[PDB]
Symmetry: C6
Subunit: 302 residues, 6 copies
């Protein structure tokens, strides 16, 4: 919805946003939103996500598709009315994104998803990219396990020439929807085939917001290597603009730079990861805050 501020209420929002990353218990926002989701009336539509066509499919709290649902309208504080209607397996009225209110007045946060190696990590979309020798897929899995902590991470596999990989975009959207409804830490391997359709353009623009609203993290690899003067800027956009956090390989083998948006209008933070390989290419992130500026951010985006 729209929100109204004065100096005092604005200062209160920024303190709340700052807390949401810096001092909240890691993973507490996710537990909170899981509570909101479980308390919705049994058959309420909770999430809509674009399929390849630009149509939207709709899910309930248990990540089952809604196929038919008769018009229902809800009135917000700002006077806005939201109306949801599903017909023949597709949204007739509504919008893409969360169909129930997960946030209230607390918007523009990067809720802390996990702490690891003495650093807090933000929920939302994490793009793992870069150029050079360091392998993206082993890193996404290392980070999934590490931010998972005591919990298992969910793996969505898409668009690679390997066994059991789904290559149909509509199944991909179904996987991702289910992952965000049911798990705090999610890995996507890979965004290669997404980076095209209206659905594909909807996902890139939606997923960070959906994830941050939930308090889950989606850790996605993206090889920028299609080296054409159109796709290569869909990649740099994706990474600059469409991500909550960026994990970029460096000059040095096994070393990665993590750049984090900590919230709306807040400082972007940075830290480095050192990594090494064990048996069967299982990567370990070694374990035992620094602000980055828009000059140094565009510098790393190179």
């Amino acid at each position: 919805m729209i929100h109204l501020y004065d100096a005092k209420s604005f200062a209160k929002l920024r303190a709340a946003q700052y807390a949401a990353f810096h001092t909240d218990a890691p993973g507490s926002w996710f537990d909170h939103t899981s509570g909101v989701l479980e308390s919705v009336e049994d058959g309420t539509p909770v999430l809509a996500i674009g399929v390849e066509s630009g149509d939207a499919i709709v899910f309930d709290k248990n990540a089952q598709r809604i196929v038919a649902y008769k018009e229902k309208s809800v009135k917000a504080e700002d006077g806005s009315v939201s109306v949801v209607q599903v017909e023949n397996g597709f949204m007739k009225q509504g919008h893409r994104g969360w169909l129930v209110d997960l946030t209230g007045e607390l918007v523009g946060c990067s809720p802390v998803v996990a702490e690891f190696g003495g650093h807090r990590y933000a929920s939302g979309m994490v793009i793992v990219t870069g150029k050079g020798n360091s392998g993206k897929t082993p890193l996404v899995h290392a980070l999934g396990e590490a931010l998972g902590g005591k919990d298992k991470y969910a793996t969505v596999r898409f668009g690679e020439p390997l066994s059991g990989y789904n290559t149909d975009f509509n199944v991909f959207v179904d996987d991702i929807a289910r992952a965000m409804l049911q798990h705090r830490v999610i890995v996507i391997d890979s965004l290669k085939n997404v980076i095209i359709s209206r659905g594909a353009f909807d996902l890139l623009s939606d997923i960070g917001a959906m994830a941050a609203s939930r308090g889950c993290v989606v850790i996605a690899s993206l090889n920028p290597t299609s080296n054409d003067d159109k796709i290569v800027e869909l990649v740099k956009e994706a990474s600059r603009a469409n991500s909550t956090s960026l994990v970029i390989s460096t000059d040095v083998d096994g070393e990665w730079q993590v750049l984090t948006r900590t919230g709306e209008g807040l400082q972007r933070l940075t830290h480095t990861l050192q990594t090494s390989y064990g048996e069967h290419s299982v990567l370990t992130i070694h374990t035992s805050q620094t602000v980055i500026k828009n000059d140094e951010l565009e510098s790393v985006l190179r």
Copy 2:
């Protein structure tokens, strides 16, 4: 409508447009247009705005959508006939923009929206942009507050990978219509996902005129960095041609240049802002005429 002029009536127009920026009481135009919208017969359409598909949706004076409204024609001075008709939630006849008269014969104004720090600010669309180290989001909120003055400012949130951010363009047009129907000072964060569809193209081309006609100011951040021939120049277009005022970061950290169109055929003004951060990234604009010359404008652009 069309308007006819001779030397004398043209001189009067120019005097009145001058006044509308320079000597009218700040915010007086907004109050006048608020009174006119309050007096409209209750279920009259007052505003049409383009949705993503290029179709238009229509609102009444309380920012609720009009689903059905039977043909109604009105005759203007110049002889022209304006018609409005809404059917199954969409404009069947009419045009985008204000559907009742707020401006009268007085057209081509940049009505003063507020005065702050010894500077008058125009209503219409303010684009906050630039490259370099200064943060756009903190600035739009600092301006929102400052121009709000005694009044709270409204925040429309769109297309950023953060909690609670809407990413559906149609919800966004809803938010913006409600904002303009109900508040003098409005912030949009951000224009990145708009900068595409027919609706997106419509919005960029319509919003400044809508705002200026109302006497409200829409303050929007625009990241120019997408760096390709299509979008990088669609951004310079937007800032050059589709904006009433421009706020651009400079060489010096925390410093910004404000470039203001004062009305139809009138001179563009310029002034500088100095800023500083307090706690939790809250920005303050320090407070305790200069014309720019069309080639110095092209210099500022880039």
Copy 3:
């Protein structure tokens, strides 16, 4: 129609075209075509112009839209059959442009619209363009007043982020049609949002011929400053070939070059204007035949 010539009838035509610019009383063609229009039967279609979709809307002599009109055919003298039919507001059979013959055998003229400051100006489309510091909007209004002479000039406003500006293309084609039907001197501010749709493309390629056939002048500002490799050339097309005259700013502030097509196959004339501002940015063109070659014209067009 098609016309047939031998050496003798061609010489006569060229003499008549020459006279239409050089010796006819200024504004006489306008009064002539006003008479032709006034003689047209009361609900007969006289003008069709393209809307955004590329469909055409149709007007009668009093600038009212025709909603329904039964198929009627008319036999021209070359043998051609012209059929007009209007259904549900849109032309179903016919063509864009004048639907009645304003011109006869007297075709390919640039009929003199006015004389000012010792110089004759042509009807048709006048594009006011160039770069540098001289302001286009003040100049189009100054020309408007100056060529209006004893008569008021009409102003069509479109696509600027200022109060009361229409931004809907279809309202815009409605305004221009009414203006050409009812007024000798017309200003458009501005062609910006036009330079896109089929309708936009149709307007650029129709309006100079429509105006010259009427004997009215359409004075339109075009800012070329949008430096896209595509669009920077659509401006030069518009100016080079879609215009009867060009008014371009020079190296010297306040000074403009006027380049005039005097008729079909005839010499293009050039002259300079000196200008100055008074109060509230009201510009005055100072007062008290030079042929220009191609290449010199292309030099100008850079």
Copy 4:
């Protein structure tokens, strides 16, 4: 249709093609095809030409539109069947071009249309283009009169900002069809607005063939000056590939180079024209064979 040759019948075709340009009485092919046309059964469709949409309209021998015509099939020598059917003013079955056989086995000719100044000129499409100071429009008219000889030439006017100029492509197609059905020498001013739609692409590709088949000449001006890396190669294609003859301005004022395709596989010829202006810009071509090679042809196309 398809034609079968051996060495002997091929040598006979080439001698006939050579004669068709070099020794036939000038304008005799046109008289012959006028005879074929007048001897067709009264209501037979004789010509189909693409309108803007890519649909085709159909004409009879007297250049009147056929609106309804029931399927009729004709068997050629090669066994091919041609079938014509018109429905609701548009061709349902058939092809674009001549619908009656004007040529028989005598195909691939550039039939001589006229002789003037001691040089023979080919029927088909003549594009008058080039860059520099020499005026195209006065030359097209000079050439029309000169090749007209004892006959008047027909002028089709299209897409210029001057009085009485049609700007609707479908009326343009009607004009051109009528011109080729009824006159040996035809001038088009200009191809500017053609050089786009499917119809526009159909015309460029068809008109030379239609004209050569008839034995009429279509003399069309084309300013190449749209200087964009797409339109500018539609122009060079148009001129290189889609023309029977090319008339190109030179280094020297008033001087033109004429380059002629004399027939299928035959030599391209070249000669120069000297010209001067009289009163009211009426141009005279001064009056009282040379082969050109593909190296020198691409050289002139520069």
Copy 5:
């Protein structure tokens, strides 16, 4: 169908493809396929070819179109089922190409079409191209005659601004289907207007395989000069990938290089032709193995 091989059966295939070019009697494949087409049950569809819209039209063995033909399925060796169905003049089920089996297990051949001047020539598509002074049209006809030998060659004429030239793409597909159904040696003048539509794209991709399957040769001229990134490289594609043999002009006037694919996986051969003109531009190829090495091929291209 698919074919299965082991070492031994693969060796046999390669021997038989070798033979099909090197030791079979010239023209024997054409006679074999002629017998097979003669024996087909009378109204069977034998050939489908793409029209402009991407739809396919279907012919019988006498080159007459099939308007209606009810579903009929046939089972292949590999288990695959081929179906053919024609409805209102268009293929409803089936594929483009030959609709009965002419090649058998022997696939991937360039069957020898003729021998001339001590050189064997392949069936399939021969593209005659190049820059420089040598004329393409005279050469395609000289080759047509020479390869025809005792037989006349067929000429398909398309898209040149000369008398009798068809310019309708659908008539062209008709001509070409008839040519391949009925003659061993075929000339197309020219490919310029094909080099676009779905049908045009289909033809370029299908014709060489159709011809080679039949054992006929299609000799087509292609002017490469259109000089833009889209078409100039679509031409090099056509000549590189879509052609069975290539004939390219050289440095030296009248001299040409012939580059021949001899079959699937076999070596490309090369030889040179010397030529001279007699009367009326009739070209003679003088008569009274060399492999090219893939990089020498890329050298010849350009």
Copy 6:
């Protein structure tokens, strides 16, 4: 499906993936999935693949097209519902790829397809490419025979100007589907006319995953020699990211580099092949683990 991992189950997966390439008996995954397919109910859909339009056609285990199949849903173990329905020959509900689960929890493998000359080869898509003198078609057939071992390999032929080559995309997807259903070793000659439609785009992005899931190998030649700025990069995409292995020609004639993805997140291997020709261009690969880094892989990809 989605899968959930903690450190322990992830280590197990990576060990299983490692074994699937390095220690499983060559060709065992193929025989395993043959068993899964053989267990499928007699007319159950097992595979869907995109046709040219972007619609999907559907096959049963014996490679027969399914024309009609009533909606049937199946519940996966992650909770996902998979619904299949076929109507009028086309998939109405479902997804592209395998419609039955061939892989289980064992996903992200490059299952070993064969061992030859002391080296293990992976199933999936193998693209044979590069520039220079070494011939791609001979090599794909040599690999076909060599990896077939005791079994015959299947050859799908498409889009070459040679006898019996299918050029219809839809027959081509039919061939590939049948090949993957019935054979472990498959050759495609060639991918040329594929590298366009939605179907072509779908194939490039589906076939490596389909094959690897089956445990078959598709060996496809791709000539990059089409040097368009657009297409030269679609080839590198195809090769970089759409392939399980790459076979590229080197500086040295007859010599090829093999680059093999060994599984999800695992090291890429490299080895060299030496080759020679015998009679009728039959190539022999000579007989009697080196990891490769990124950057070295990009060096190769130039």
